[PDB]
A paper describes a structure:
The Vtc4p β-tunnel domain is not unique to eukaryotic polyP polymerases but is a structural hallmark of triphosphate tunnel metalloenzymes (TTMs), whose characteristic features are the presence of a topologically closed hydrophilic β-barrel, the preference for triphosphate-containing substrates, and for a divalent metal co-factor (PFAM families CYTH and VTC). Members of the ancient triphosphate tunnel metalloenzyme family can be found in all kingdoms of life. Our comparative analysis defines that most of these enzymes share a common catalytic mechanism in their tunnel centers, yet they have evolved different substrate recognition modes on their tunnel entries. The observed substrate plasticity apparently allows TTM proteins to act on a wide array of enzyme substrates and to perform very different reactions, many of which likely remain to be discovered.
We determined co-crystal structures of AtTTM3 with tripolyphosphate and Mg2+ or Mn2+ metal co-factors in two independent crystal lattices. As AtTTM3 efficiently hydrolyzes PPPi in the presence of Mg2+ ions only at neutral or basic pH, we used two crystal forms grown at pH 5.0 (form A) and pH 7.5 (form B) to crystallize substrate-metal complexes under non-hydrolyzable and hydrolyzable conditions, respectively. In both crystal forms, we determined structures of AtTTM3 in the presence of PPPi and either MgCl2 or MnCl2. At pH 5.0 (form A) we find a triphosphate moiety bound in the AtTTM3 active site. Here, PPPi coordinates a Mg2+/Mn2+ ion that acts as a bridge between the substrate and the invariant Glu-169AtTTM3. The same metal co-factor coordination has been previously found in a Vtc4p AppNHp-Mn2+ complex. In all our structures the catalytic Mg2+ ions can be substituted by Mn2+ ions, for which we calculated phased anomalous difference electron density maps from data collected near the Mn-K edge to confirm their modeled positions. Comparison of AtTTM3 and Vtc4p revealed that four basic residues, which lead the growing polyP chain away from the active site in Vtc4p, are specifically replaced by four glutamate residues (Glu-2AtTTM3, Glu-4AtTTM3, Glu-90AtTTM3, and Glu171AtTTM3) in AtTTM3. These residues, which form an acidic patch in the vicinity of the AtTTM3 tripolyphosphate substrate, are conserved among diverse TTM proteins with different catalytic activities.
Numbering used by the authors: 0 to 210
Write the structure that this text describes.
Amino acid sequence: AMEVEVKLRLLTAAAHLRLTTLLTPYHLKTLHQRNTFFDTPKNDLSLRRAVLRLRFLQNAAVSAASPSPPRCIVSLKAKPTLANGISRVEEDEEEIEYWIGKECVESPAKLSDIGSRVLKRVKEEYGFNDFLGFVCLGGFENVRNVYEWRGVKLEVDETKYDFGNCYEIECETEEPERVKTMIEEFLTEEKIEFSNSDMTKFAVFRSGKLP
Ligand SMILES: [Mn+2]
């Protein structure tokens, strides 16, 4: 399925602080995310412009009385385009058990035990019989604030790489040009410095430096 989202870079931590402060009345939830990625040592998926990700996440305000495991989501993203602050990608995602997700990080071959259609698709589309040749590339942490604002869900990200923090605003939408304009007018009015995001979080991770 084709996913579309507006993707804007917030240019400083101060801009990000100002934004999160202003959006506080619209706050829906806060997600703590850890993203991990998988490929062959020869970057077979990356060369076919495919990204295979296991995300571990928890709601920061999860009930203290009723604890639950962190959620684990496997996602395959393919045929990406990112230009003019609009990201388009073919995406397939599926939830899996926390414990098996964690074991796949240490042993990517175990990705076949899962019996996940997403991973069956990786095999069939890209010509793998199994994940015996895969490594975990590692990954990074993200704090995602979700807001319900002017009819859309805004996602404000603080991505914490080893080489420093990056800040983004995202919005999933079928009307990216209208929504992008709406967001930009707001940021402009509030003097929150921004630009188009021209790199995915994974690309920034792999570059090993701030964009
Ligand atoms: Mn995104």
